């Protein structure tokens, strides 16, 4: 009840977008792959994405998933969404990881309801995070 089960695990390079200089930067400040989970909170029926660098366990994404999140499959292997502070981009090691992770995210959202392109307006202007923390 006060614990979270992993419903999905994917390996990915976690990026964050820099609005002012219009480029993607590695989340946490260092290149490298992360292990990214979608966690379901058994008691509260909420979901969270948690990504940690494989090398040193640095937490580079810890993001509540709100009803209505805009999850953009920009390419077969690069998917984007945002929270109140940052715009994330997951560059998956493989189309298979990406398909699994996107599928799990879309299911969670149903329950709740130069190689890399920039985030579109629907992502940049997503206010779904505003339905939380109030």
Residue numbers in the entry: 0 to 112, 133 to 153
Give the published text.
To minimize the influence of the fusion on the domain–peptide interaction, we introduced a long, flexible linker between C-terminus of the ENAH EVH1 domain and the PCARE B sequence. The high-resolution structure led to the surprising discovery that the LPPPP motif in PCARE binds at the expected canonical site, but in the opposite orientation from previously observed Ena/VASP EVH1 domains engaged with proline-rich peptides. PCARE828–848 uses a 14-residue alpha helix-rich extension C-terminal to the LPPPP motif to make additional contacts to an extended region on the EVH1 domain, explaining its high affinity. PCARE residues Phe843 and Leu846 make hydrophobic interactions with Ala83 and Pro65 on ENAH. The side chain of Asp840 on PCARE docks into a polar pocket on ENAH made up of the backbone atoms of ENAH residues Lys69 and Arg81. Most intriguing is the interaction between Val837 on PCARE and the hydrophobic groove in ENAH, which typically engages large aromatic residues. Specificity arises from a mechanism whereby PCARE stabilizes a conformation of the ENAH EVH1 domain that is inaccessible to family members VASP and EVL.
The Ena/VASP proteins are a family of actin regulators involved in functions ranging from T-cell activation to axon guidance. There are three paralogs in mammals: ENAH (often called Mena), VASP, and EVL. The EVH1 domain binds SLiMs with the consensus motif [FWYL]PXΦP, where X is any amino acid and Φ is any hydrophobic residue.
